[PDB]
Amino acid sequence: GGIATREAYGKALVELGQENPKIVVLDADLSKSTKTSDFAKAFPERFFNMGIAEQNLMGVAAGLSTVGKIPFASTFAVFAAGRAFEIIRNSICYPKLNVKIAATHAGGASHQAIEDLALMRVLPNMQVFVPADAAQTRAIVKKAAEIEGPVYIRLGRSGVPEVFSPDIRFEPGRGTVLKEGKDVTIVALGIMTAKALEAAKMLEAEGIAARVVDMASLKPIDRELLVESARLTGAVVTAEEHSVIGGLGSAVAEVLSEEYPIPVVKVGVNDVPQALLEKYGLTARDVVAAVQKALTLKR
Amino acid sequence: GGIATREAYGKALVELGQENPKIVVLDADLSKSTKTSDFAKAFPERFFNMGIAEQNLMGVAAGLSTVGKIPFASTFAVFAAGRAFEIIRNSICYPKLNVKIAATHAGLTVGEDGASHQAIEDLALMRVLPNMQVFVPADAAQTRAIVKKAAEIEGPVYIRLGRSGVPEVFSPDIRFEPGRGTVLKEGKDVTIVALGIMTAKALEAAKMLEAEGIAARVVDMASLKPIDRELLVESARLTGAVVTAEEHSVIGGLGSAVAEVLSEEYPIPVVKVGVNDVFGESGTPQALLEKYGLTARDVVAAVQKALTLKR
Amino acid sequence: GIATREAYGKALVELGQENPKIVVLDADLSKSTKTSDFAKAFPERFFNMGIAEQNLMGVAAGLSTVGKIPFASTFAVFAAGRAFEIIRNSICYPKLNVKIAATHAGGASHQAIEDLALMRVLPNMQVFVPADAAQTRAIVKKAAEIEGPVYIRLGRSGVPEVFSPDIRFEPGRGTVLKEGKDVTIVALGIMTAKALEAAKMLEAEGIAARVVDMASLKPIDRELLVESARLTGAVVTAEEHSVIGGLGSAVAEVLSEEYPIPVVKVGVNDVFGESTPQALLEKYGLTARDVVAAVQKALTLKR
Amino acid sequence: GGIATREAYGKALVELGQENPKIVVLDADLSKSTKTSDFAKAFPERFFNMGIAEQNLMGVAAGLSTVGKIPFASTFAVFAAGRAFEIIRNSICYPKLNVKIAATHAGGASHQAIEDLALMRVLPNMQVFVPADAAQTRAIVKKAAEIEGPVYIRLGRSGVPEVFSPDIRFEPGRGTVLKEGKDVTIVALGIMTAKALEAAKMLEAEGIAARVVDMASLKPIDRELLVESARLTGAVVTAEEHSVIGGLGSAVAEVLSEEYPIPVVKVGVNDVFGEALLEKYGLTARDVVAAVQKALTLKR
């Protein structure tokens, strides 16, 4: 029972505020919890909390980034994929502004943005990071503050299992081998990383040794680690709480098809808390099933 | 060459208007050319020519589709990827409204220096939306077939059109079906999958490859979404390597769709020809990309790389 | 009596039966909206889609130029905020034939206390505020016949009956509901019935008040204001709206240039969103008793 | 032939910057003239020159005001009345944020905001100041920096006649008697103040003594001075380069009808038609003269 990535994000911003005087935080939420958050109390002069439309909040972030601030804009994936999309694309990505978008994803059907990562991935300059747990969130937030350019960080509201130690360092374009195995590689991000580890345990019990790779860095992706995993194991399963189109599965297939073609079987949302994970097919057992399918495709 | 796909579209709408009384056409352009287009003159009571913002034009199309009309909204890829994106996604795709978007895409030619005003990732943005089907005609004849089919199918459709004349590839009586592509040439060494302007260039490339002893199958895949999975898998089993070619970003378009399919069904090399740097590779001048585009020779180079990846 | 919002819904059905060019737009996706009388009677002329309110106004604008007469159901808070620019720039300056039916909720921002003032200052916009069900029906029918932008302010709660079912509405014409020689009370919306209550209370103290309903805020009935001024020598205005830029301001503008007399304004003085209907009226000072007090002040100002 | 109020504004910001470290200036204009303006050169770290949409510029001003800055947002009246209106009303006025909007007003028909003052006047908490000349602009800008709350200052690009001395002090809610007269009072603001003085001269030549009042403080308006002028002269003419509805004439009528009813005859824009201009719109000294003659006949 580790804390939510959204909660880890809030704590990481307080540390960043202490260490980096250029960091500013923007939030359009006017609730009491927001106004009395740790960042709000510790750095009131760098906390921009106003009742303004989400697309306008992104526009403010854009402006502040051009005058020497490093804005972290707290928002929701549904806004990023909808009403704020145009400003993100036209004002932030093409001009390459230094805005960090911290988008909470709630895990109609529209109000669930199942393709947020896909939309951000296709924009120029945008980097897309999906922390697995509290410790990785902190590492991603600190790194995002130091890199130049637009960043999308996907967060969650519910507690998620601990996967990494507190002193992990994050680097864009670098993933992590969490477990070794020669028969298949499972590449996962977000909540699916812990489930990939669970799946690898279940697979061991049936005589299948799975390498498990965390790929929080969805864009830019770790091409060399994917190619090395492909050469060693000969088959990949990707797992993401996201549409199977345009996310991790697509990014991995795009890389391997041009470098070292092997089976890539995608676990994700196919169509449009636990009962919904189960209906969409985002359990450890779903990953197991995908691995069995990946093994049959080896040639 | 043949006429522009944008021009074929306008003519096809006139025929549709004659055959199908539910078809309505929306266009925000108030120029003389628009007001006196053939559809405008033939069916003025079904031509909604309204000087409103492009997102509002799409909102009218959305509304008209819910009251029994079949709206064809003529717009630009720049609007679809920008100011109209939210209404397309939230009002048309998620609710699955019966709107056909005919989006003219500008050539590979930066505007003033607004690279954004190019919309080089239009197909990718439409592809990832639920329910949206994405069709990219190669020439006049295929445009007509796509427009007529789009009118009959239920649900949101994005049709990408072009302003410049493009070579004839298909015969006038071609039939289009979503999910079905076409083998234009047979060959056992590699398959070239292309759409839009790249289809004719893939045929040119196949000729150049023959002269070097490489026999290329060429497939037209105007139906980007849903894609022809069976034809891709058959091509993969027969030839063992694919090159994709699209006048579009290499991320999220045809190359990505093909790689997604083959990696889960029959993994083989998929080498992608498309726009790599959306600002222009800061090496070669603008005049070069403007004169050439992506070329048959680029497809040739991609094929040679694909052959080395066979295992 | 029923809510003006409810009378509006019924009137649209009648309009639909008589006028084939009428279309209704509504962004509300609730079951009540999808099964409203107009939705059921004229589904082919009902545009119900989840789109932003400013886009709904933009759609109404477009539809008005292709032969439809669009009635755009919205809220006063949207008209005064997110939809304001499209209303001003796309509908008013170009003079498009759009009818805005804005339900006014009776935070601070989420209460548009200046909706009428913002609409009044726009060119070409006419502004009508029905007192009750019968006047709503009359205003909706007239709005469909006039050419040009109209703002009709509606409410969600039941309001007392004031007019008979055969009332005719004409823009630019108000109505003397009660005669009196000492003062004139000019009111609109919910304040019309309260003006009648106030006039009864005033009669019991020997003050005879003329009561005028001015649902037609813009264009205002200048002639009736001037005649009331000449006959009674003092006016009280009453509106559920800011004292700046609404009925009181419109009346003062007219009388100061034609027949200057006291105009004492009853309305919202300061924002302070106070979350009961009655407690709200009392805190803002919109009761019959407040109108009585205003009349007493108006009498002392006669010169 | 003094300088433009927009130019006086630029100069006043430099002084404010020297005296007040919390002042920040926002401008979306990316031209060379803006980037090398005096404020830009003197205080580059407090000049936020960002090519963003005008409504986003206002959003930045809003945010900066809540973190201890005193932002002056340079914009145009057409943006305040259009694309930036919603942020001004919903983000700045209702929450009562400390933002000063310096709106240049150009002197379709939409792109001329003839009702900018009316739109700002009706919003809660917004104060509205319309300087007549360079000296009053400086005074208004300096005062705006000290008061708490949203302010709208209307500026112009063209040179305007000098009306006030360089050391004038401005106070919200206070107007100024510029000339005494017992027969009528002319209340004016902006460019109309100089013309009211011209009209008063013309009226003197016909035996009519007009008091002239400058009312740069449109909101809050100087109620006491209006009532005193009404008691002393018995008739008012208002003059504004603005729609006759919802501006100065309406503000004066609102006050006098509830305190001391007298004729208020309004000179202003009657009819919108983006179009010799002063003459067609009816904003000349002679128009003010004609209004005075009408006001005299209305005395009872």
Author numbering:
A (entry chain BBB): 2 to 108, 115 to 279, 286 to 312
B (entry chain DDD): 2 to 312
C (entry chain AAA): 3 to 108, 115 to 283, 285 to 312
D (entry chain CCC): 2 to 108, 115 to 282, 288 to 312
Please quote the paper that reports this structure:
Transketolase (TK, EC 2.2.1.1) is a thiamine diphosphate-dependant (TPP) enzyme which plays an important role in the pentose phosphate pathway. It catalyses the rearrangement of sugar molecules by the transfer of a C2 unit from D-xylulose-5-phosphate to erythrose-4-phosphate, resulting in the formation of fructose-6-phosphate and glyceraldehyde-3-phosphate which are fed back into the glycolysis pathway. Here, we report the biochemical and structural characterization of the ‘split-gene’ TK from this organism (ChTK-F) which has been reconstituted by combining the two proteins encoded on the C. hydroxydothermus genome.
The apparent molecular mass of the native enzyme after gel filtration chromatography indicated that ChTK-N eluted as a dimer (∼62 kDa) whereas ChTK-C was purified as a tetramer (∼132 kDa). The ChTK-C dimer formation buries 1700 Å2 per monomer (13% of its solvent accessible area), which suggests a dimer is a likely oligomeric form of ChTK-C in solution. The ChTK-C dimer has exposed surface hydrophobic patches on the interface with TPP and ChTK-N. Formation of the ChTK-C homotetramer observed in two crystal forms buries these hydrophobic patches, however only around 5% of each ChTK-C surface accessible area is buried. Such a tetramer is observed in the two crystal forms and in size exclusion chromatography, however it is unlikely to be stable at the lower concentrations of the protein in solution. Initial activity measurements of the gene products ChTK-N and ChTK-C and reconstituted enzyme, ChTK-F were carried out using a colorimetric tetrazolium red assay that showed that the individual ChTK-N and ChTK-C did not possess TK activity but the reconstituted ChTK-F was active. The individual ‘split-gene’ products of this novel TK enzyme have been shown to have no activity in either a tetrazolium red based colorimetric assay or the more accurate HPLC assay.
